[PDB]
């Protein structure tokens, strides 16, 4: 993987692993989202970024500061097939004290056609009280050495997919999974659940059938509260419509929401 | 005229007026660029900049800067006829230390459909050195106040026709229209010839033919350096091409020093 010449943005090319396909021999969306989370991080690091699994700013050290997902927007055309070399481009931006944006383009490496595309919306957190925050100038100042200052998107169109509100699913739901836990493997280095932990969750609820006649094209998915290595999560879905679902990821205790998303997906 | 619900960007109506329109009776590209013009200043008087003819910041004002067109794009789909009520909604948006935009949509106040949209790229300038700089801290501060802070943009779409490259026309030209001179009605309350008369003079070498027989879709026009108020213009045009495009050059007619350059695209009646 490198930086491109203008050092505005990072690429990089996968082999597609035997472990990391489905059913129809290609790429689960599990390991695309994990593909993304790798060039992201090795996008940070050739940018100056900490490397202690936080990937944060000198100012965001000094402030006790870390970056928290709140959306991650994934749309596939072509799943790469086991043995397939995927190219990855990501890019960051700011977007004002909101927060930041990372983008990511897919492509087929032998064809040079786009595969699919993704973006991200992330929101500053202060690391011990868990407490939501602006972007200081500071930070603003230290994005600007490494984004492209006029504006660059993996989904431009107005009103696109990407920005969406999603709805909280009513009870009851049509499908379930009930009691779910992270083991180790769904820890990152720093032992919190991996956000493509939460993918694969939501995922759980869709019926076999659905995933067996049907691939799966757009995935939103907004992240409010983590869960812990100790709690227990219950996966919902509703059918809204292609076939379309209403999800909703909450704790089995109380009910407290983690994630809520929607998933749209097209008869094979 | 005023700013929408969030504050973040401004709408304002225009009756297309009798002198206002063309032959076919619809508004001139002049006559659009001139109301994209209007509803911008009073976008900048709501939301607290000067006013005396430049739209400067409390900062800008203290160090002596004013903003100055580097590009302006438009793409028309519909021209509003003659006493046509036509909506446009306008916003800027801060770009790093490059430089700010602003954008345009326009909507037919009946049906409310998209009839034309326009970006303009806009870049810092010292009014005593007329030298070009960078955007500071303070300024992308003010900007924040009053600009939407996701991206929000006229021409979302990946290689589109308004950052595209232009080149420069090399002699001899097809067509020309020379010795063109701007009189009073050409300069602004600031005695500085207004951007809109740049595209009129881009046009004057367009064939009459081609005017007659085809709309025009989108003009693309860089803006190098200024016409003084005793400066005269030389416009160039060669065609580059059911569609008909052109590449144009405007250069002051004595030394040949290059003060725009531009494309259009316009399509069969
Ligand atoms: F994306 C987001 F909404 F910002 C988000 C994602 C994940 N966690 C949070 N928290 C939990 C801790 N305290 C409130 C904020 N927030
Ligand atoms: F857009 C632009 F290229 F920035 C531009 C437009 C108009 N004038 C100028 N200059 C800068 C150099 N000194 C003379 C005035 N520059």
Redesign the interface.
């Given at each position: 993987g490198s930086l491109t010449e203008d050092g505005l943005s990072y690429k990089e090319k996968f082999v597609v692993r035997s472990y990391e396909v489905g059913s129809n021999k290609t790429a689960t969306v599990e390991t695309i989202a994990n593909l993304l989370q790798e060039v992201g991080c090795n996008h940070a690091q050739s940018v100056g970024f900490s490397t202690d699994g936080f990937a944060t700013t000198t100012t965001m050290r000094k402030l006790h500061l870390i970056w928290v997902t709140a959306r991650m927007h994934i749309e596939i055309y072509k799943y790469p097939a086991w043995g397939d070399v995927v190219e990855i481009e990501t890019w960051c931006?700011s977007?004002?004290?909101?927060g930041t944006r990372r983008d990511w383009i897919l492509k087929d490496s032998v064809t040079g056609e786009v595969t699919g595309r993704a973006t991200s919306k992330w929101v500053m957190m202060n690391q011990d009280t868990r407490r939501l925050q602006k972007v200081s100038?500071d930070v603003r100042?230290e994005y600007?050495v490494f984004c492209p200052?006029?504006?660059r998107?993996a989904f431009?169109?107005?009103n696109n997919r990407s920005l969406k509100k999603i709805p909280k699913l009513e009870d009851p739901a049509q499908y379930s999974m009930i009691g779910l836990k992270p083991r180790r493997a769904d820890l990152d280095m720093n032992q919190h659940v991996n956000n493509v932990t939460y993918i694969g969750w939501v995922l759980e609820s869709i019926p076999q059938e659905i995933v067996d006649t049907h691939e799966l094209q757009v995935i939103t998915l907004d992240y409010r509260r983590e869960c812990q290595q100790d709690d227990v999560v219950d996966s919902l879905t509703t059918t809204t419509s292609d076939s379309q679902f209403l999800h909703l990821l909450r704790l089995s205790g109380d009910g407290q929401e983690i994630n809520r998303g929607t998933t749209l997906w097209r008869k094979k």
């Open positions: 931006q977007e004002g004290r909101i100038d100042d600007l200052q006029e504006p998107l431009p169109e107005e």
